[model samples]
Target: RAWKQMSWFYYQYLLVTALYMLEPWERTVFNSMLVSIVGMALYTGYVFMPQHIMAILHYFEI
Candidate 1:
């Protein structure tokens, strides 16, 4: 496993893997305009109120 971290193919696989996971989530969120609006609301709230979403999710307590 030498220099595996620096491989471009590995990075591509990692990104596509994450995209595979996200597609279904994107569908759920896309079904309603309300869902999309709420997402933007939360995004703006984080920008204005300056709270990280990860901390709310308990991302290792920040």
Candidate 2:
């Protein structure tokens, strides 16, 4: 259970460690690179539209 969650946690941990040790300008560039990678994933449909799946969780159907 939660295999993906474990990897996600490690990924976030390393990201935070890198950011903490990076220079201000380096952090800016690093974030930009991250954004670019996410953008590529969105463009290539590796990620789906979040709004399409999100709904009011507690709303009862009429």
Candidate 3:
């Protein structure tokens, strides 16, 4: 599905971002990016991959 593909790119973006240096001031911007990326991923997973997400949470006891 499109959501799966989009989420894949989101993960890739996060990985690429992590490879760079995150300065102190950049932390604010990076934190915002992290929030948006996580929110987007969580929203998509909740809608399109509920069972998988639940399983992951159950495993982690989250």
Candidate 4:
């Protein structure tokens, strides 16, 4: 359940981000903010989420 929730959370994130980029493709300002915020978000999720997910599953011990 936890893993599934995490998966869907990221699915929603990416979908929204894709839409976000689409809306302001011609705007340098919004695009930079997207790179700043969503890039950092994607980096953190890629780095931290997978590692901690397993640890959390062990804590739950299902």
Candidate 5:
């Protein structure tokens, strides 16, 4: 139960952090949009495939 709750909390934290990081930008509009789209794609994939998705998640983490 605790693990489940922690997982949920972390998911929300990552999502909020990703959105927050994406919110500020004056240049690289195209790159930003591409990142946003790819990020969302990876996030969706993460929901279905944990092992494979970890790589994508790590990409953003760095």
Candidate 6:
């Protein structure tokens, strides 16, 4: 469980960073703040909600 949680956290962090970097134009103040806030919320929720995390992982399994 701990390992799963850690992996999920890191994966989300990396994915969000990659998305942000890929869209340089979207790095404007409003978009940057929106992405940052939403990303953090998503990561935090995934870390705490095991069932939701499992559902997310399952989606990637396909």
Better of 1 and 4 by lDDT: 4
Over 1-62, each residue of candidate 5 has an lDDT whose tens digit, in order, gives: 99999999966865765643553353357457879999999898778867756788898899
- Which residue runs of candidate 2 sit more than 4 Å off their true CA positions? 1-15, 46-62
TM-score of each: 0.31, 0.47, 0.47, 0.35, 0.36, 0.38
Q: Rank the candidates by TM-score, best first.
A: 3, 2, 6, 5, 4, 1
Winning candidate number (lDDT): 3
Which residue pairs in candidate 4 have backbone atoms (N, alpha carbon, C) closer than 3 angstroms, thus clashing?
none
What stretches of model 5 exceed 4 Å from their correct place? 1-27, 50-62
Candidate 1 TM-score to native: 0.31
On the 0 to 100 scale, the lDDT of residue 60 in model 2 is 39
> RMSD in angstroms, all models?
9.1, 9.4, 11.6, 8.9, 11.3, 10.5
lDDT of 4 at 53: 76
Candidate 1: which stretches are off by over 4 Å? 1-31, 52-62
Once fitted onto the true fold, the runs of candidate 3 whose alpha carbons sit more than 4 angstroms away are 1-23, 52-62
Candidates sorted by lDDT, best first: 3, 6, 4, 2, 5, 1
**Candidate 4, TM-score vs. the true structure?**
0.35
Clashes of 2: 0
lDDT of 2 by residue, 1-62 (tens): 59999988967865876776778798779779989999898776645655443344335342
lDDT of 4 by residue, 1-43 (tens): 9999999996687577664355445455655787899989888
Preferred candidate (TM-score higher): 1 or 4: 4
Q: Distance (Å) between predicted and true CA of 41, model 4?
A: 0.6
Residue 4 Cα positional deviation in candidate 1, in Å, after optimal superposition: 47
lDDT string for model 1 (1-62, tens) is 55776686756764765643566667455446656898999888877875665568787765
